[PDB]
Design an enzyme around this catalytic site. Structure first.
Site, short mmCIF file in Angstrom:
data_model
loop_
_atom_site.label_atom_id
_atom_site.label_comp_id
_atom_site.label_asym_id
_atom_site.label_seq_id
_atom_site.Cartn_x
_atom_site.Cartn_y
_atom_site.Cartn_z
N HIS A 135 50.30 43.33 43.31
CA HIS A 135 50.87 43.45 44.65
C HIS A 135 49.84 43.13 45.74
O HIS A 135 50.14 42.40 46.69
CB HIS A 135 51.42 44.88 44.81
CG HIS A 135 52.26 45.07 46.04
ND1 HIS A 135 51.73 45.53 47.23
CD2 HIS A 135 53.58 44.90 46.26
CE1 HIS A 135 52.69 45.61 48.13
NE2 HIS A 135 53.82 45.23 47.57
N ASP B 259 23.81 52.28 46.18
CA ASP B 259 24.59 52.17 47.42
C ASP B 259 23.65 51.76 48.56
O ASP B 259 23.25 52.61 49.36
CB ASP B 259 25.24 53.54 47.70
CG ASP B 259 25.96 53.60 49.04
OD1 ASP B 259 26.20 52.54 49.65
OD2 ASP B 259 26.26 54.72 49.50
N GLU C 285 25.10 45.14 50.93
CA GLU C 285 25.00 45.48 49.51
C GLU C 285 24.28 44.42 48.69
O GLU C 285 24.59 43.22 48.77
CB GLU C 285 26.39 45.70 48.90
CG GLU C 285 26.91 47.14 49.01
CD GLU C 285 26.26 48.06 48.00
OE1 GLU C 285 25.60 47.56 47.08
OE2 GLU C 285 26.43 49.29 48.11
N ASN D 227 27.06 53.73 52.42
CA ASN D 227 28.41 54.02 52.89
C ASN D 227 29.22 54.84 51.90
O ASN D 227 30.43 55.06 52.09
CB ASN D 227 29.15 52.75 53.32
CG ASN D 227 29.52 51.85 52.15
OD1 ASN D 227 29.04 52.02 51.03
ND2 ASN D 227 30.38 50.87 52.42
N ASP E 187 29.65 48.03 46.42
CA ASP E 187 30.91 47.59 47.01
C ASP E 187 30.77 46.23 47.69
O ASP E 187 30.68 46.12 48.91
CB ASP E 187 31.50 48.65 47.96
CG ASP E 187 30.61 48.94 49.15
OD1 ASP E 187 29.40 49.15 48.93
OD2 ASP E 187 31.12 48.98 50.28
N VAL F 222 48.72 27.88 47.19
CA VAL F 222 49.41 28.09 48.46
C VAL F 222 48.41 28.06 49.62
O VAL F 222 47.35 27.47 49.52
CB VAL F 222 50.19 29.43 48.43
CG1 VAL F 222 51.38 29.32 47.48
CG2 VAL F 222 49.28 30.57 47.96
N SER G 182 56.95 44.54 52.38
CA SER G 182 55.56 44.39 51.95
C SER G 182 55.07 42.95 52.10
O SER G 182 53.87 42.72 52.21
CB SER G 182 55.40 44.83 50.49
OG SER G 182 55.47 46.24 50.38
N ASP H 46 45.91 48.67 49.14
CA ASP H 46 46.98 48.31 48.22
C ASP H 46 46.52 48.54 46.78
O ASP H 46 45.75 49.47 46.51
CB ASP H 46 47.36 46.85 48.46
CG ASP H 46 48.82 46.53 48.15
OD1 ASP H 46 49.24 46.66 46.99
OD2 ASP H 46 49.54 46.11 49.08
N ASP I 17 42.40 30.60 44.50
CA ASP I 17 42.91 30.40 45.85
C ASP I 17 42.60 31.56 46.81
O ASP I 17 43.06 31.54 47.95
CB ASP I 17 44.42 30.06 45.85
CG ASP I 17 44.77 29.01 46.89
OD1 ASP I 17 43.87 28.22 47.26
OD2 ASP I 17 45.94 28.97 47.35
N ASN J 139 62.18 49.11 52.24
CA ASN J 139 63.20 48.22 51.69
C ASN J 139 64.52 48.90 51.33
O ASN J 139 65.24 48.43 50.44
CB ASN J 139 62.68 47.52 50.44
CG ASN J 139 61.41 46.76 50.69
OD1 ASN J 139 61.12 46.37 51.81
ND2 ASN J 139 60.62 46.55 49.64
CA LIG Z 1 23.92 47.67 45.51
CA LIG Z 2 27.68 50.62 49.44
#
Ligand SMILES: [Ca+2]
Ligand SMILES: [Ca+2]
Ligand SMILES: [Ca+2]
Ligand SMILES: [Ca+2]
Ligand SMILES: [Ca+2]
Ligand SMILES: [Ca+2]
Ligand SMILES: [Ca+2]
Ligand SMILES: [Ca+2]
Lengths: 329, 329
Positions: A104, A76, A69, A80, A85, A122, A269, A49, A58, A201
């Site tokens: 969104h 990296d 990681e 990957n 990440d 919520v 959505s 998304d 929340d 929609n």
């Molecule tokens: Ca790292």
């Molecule tokens: Ca990585």
């Protein structure tokens, strides 16, 4: 209320007593389901998304963390293809940061798994779950099929490496048939991932007017129409006797948005993450289900729905309590 | 900045110097146009949507007030079929109050006519203009073709009663062809009203895949695709060499939302009010243009746009400065 989350009563999709002006029990029976399970952080759900605001009070507790990681070292470490990440990635820039700068993706994330019983905001279908984000849509809505494919490949990569990720939320659509996208989805099927997708929609029949990715015929695609607080099919919802599978609440859904806020959105959505959330909740009870068994269970366990009958394969509206019950093991 | 509105620099669609990461001058040349006119409250624009938050501090000065209604007396003083319709109506409930409880209608209203140079928030294509609301979409997105027709009929009723309502903003779509809706739009053409409509956000060709109301063949329908800060056609925009007319900024548009707030949305729904706003601004300079002359002028005065070329009738992106110049009486 069912939880101490202050905005709980606005969540008619989880629990409907007619308090938003609809029909009592037009809901997914979440509080009942929660007597069986409120979910596990060990279940990982991918949201493809505009990103995920993992800093939202929340959502923070339910943000996925990449065990492979080392944060912030510029390397990296898990090899990957993305550096640092920790919570997911940005498929546009390749930066290892799925932070939502649009809204969104955070909204759908909150429906899947806003922290439950933490006295704030919520609560999602899961009180506890791990959400990994892949941002392929920019702050201004810019994105590509190539980007969505990078996201799917990334998620499949995590799963193949042993991350317990078997559900993808795809609250997006557009364009025509892409063999490259079909193929990416096929790869996700071989990895035992359920690909939940919004029906659209525009209030038309998807059997005559295909909408992607929900119209992909891949067996692991679960295509979702939207329902409202009266258990009608939402007036905006697309449908399809063969191309859409079932419905879930998508009209007037309150959820998390960035900047520590909450907002009400409507669309297929919003229906999609109730289903992705329900899938994750089921997998907290019975991890031994094949993807197809999971999909069919979500469909068959739903409440018979007059509006969805003849307009979807199952003619049912999501019921996560019955899903958990039917999931045994 | 061109105005003292604190959020002005976020409004790339009005003035783009690359400050949002895009291309300098990919904009509608609003500050240039404003040297000619900043709009008139005597030009009335109707917004058919989720309503209009006429209480918003950056919209209130430009909210239309029905001169024929005594507020709060329970009487339909002007005999238009709606009681106490001071700022417009709710077509769902027939109550004379178009208050936006969703947000979408307020967002498009702000793009048309958020108060300019008032040291608050944003600013519309018009600094001064009159905006009347008809709410046919509920807080949870519920609506119908009947409701849309009631709104069009209401606006046409105002125009036929002597209100200078010359432009309608329709940032919505869905459903199949309706002859009754086509007929309502024909009545609006007979009343000298321009019907501006969003092309849709599904990245498909409307020529082969009709989208309504964008695809109605009525001559007064002006169908709008979305462009971004680099002057590309927005990745999500629908197009149509014969069924879509031109484009305008719709990617990452900041505007007013209810609760005295501001928010950034993307879609053809955001491009549409740039065009509706420009139409009203043109009419402040040359009120004597016919609806069809106005439509043609907006299309022909636009900047040539490589992306929109071959994908729309005019192949142009909105330029309101050039529109004002070309309109000079
Ligand atoms: Ca790292
Ligand atoms: Ca990585
Ligand atoms: Ca219930
Ligand atoms: Ca029930
Ligand atoms: Ca410029
Ligand atoms: Ca220019
Ligand atoms: Ca009246
Ligand atoms: Ca009155």
């Amino acid at each position: 209320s069912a939880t101490n989350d202050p905005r709980f009563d606005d969540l008619w999709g989880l629990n409907n007593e007619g308090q938003t002006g609809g029909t009592a029990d037009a809901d997914i029976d979440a509080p009942e389901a929660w007597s069986i399970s409120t979910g596990s952080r060990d279940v990982v759900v991918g949201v493809i998304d505009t990103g995920v605001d993992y800093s939202h009070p929340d959502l923070a507790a339910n943000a996925w963390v990449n065990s492979g990681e080392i944060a912030g070292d510029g390397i990296d470490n898990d090899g990957n293809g993305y550096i640092d990440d920790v919570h997911g990635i940005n498929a546009i820039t390749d930066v290892g940061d799925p932070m939502d700068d649009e809204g969104h993706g955070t909204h759908v994330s909150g429906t899947i798994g806003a922290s439950g019983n933490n006295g704030v905001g919520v609560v999602g279908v899961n009180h506890d779950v791990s959400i990994v984000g892949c941002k392929f849509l920019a702050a201004d809505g810019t994105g590509s099929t190539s980007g969505a494919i990078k996201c799917i490949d990334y998620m499949v990569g995590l799963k193949n490496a042993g991350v317990n990720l078997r559900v993808l939320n795809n609250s997006w659509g557009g364009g025509g048939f892409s063999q490259a996208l079909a193929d990416a989805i096929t790869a996700s099927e071989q990895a035992d991932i359920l690909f939940v997708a919004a029906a659209g929609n525009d209030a038309v029949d998807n059997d005559q007017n295909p909408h992607y990715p929900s119209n992909y015929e891949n067996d692991n695609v679960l295509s979702i129409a939207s329902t409202d607080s009266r258990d009608n099919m939402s007036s905006f919802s697309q449908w399809g006797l063969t191309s859409v599978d079932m419905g879930a609440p998508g009209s007037g859904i309150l959820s998390t948005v960035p900047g520590n806020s909450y907002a009400t959105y409507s669309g297929t959505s919003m229906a999609t993450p109730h289903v992705a959330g329900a899938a994750a909740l089921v997998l907290s009870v019975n991890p031994d289900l094949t993807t197809l068994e999971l999909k069919e269970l979500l469909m068959s366990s739903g409440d018979a729905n007059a509006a969805l009958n003849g307009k979807t394969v199952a003619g049912t509206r999501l019921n996560v309590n019955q899903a958990l019950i039917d999931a045994d093991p």
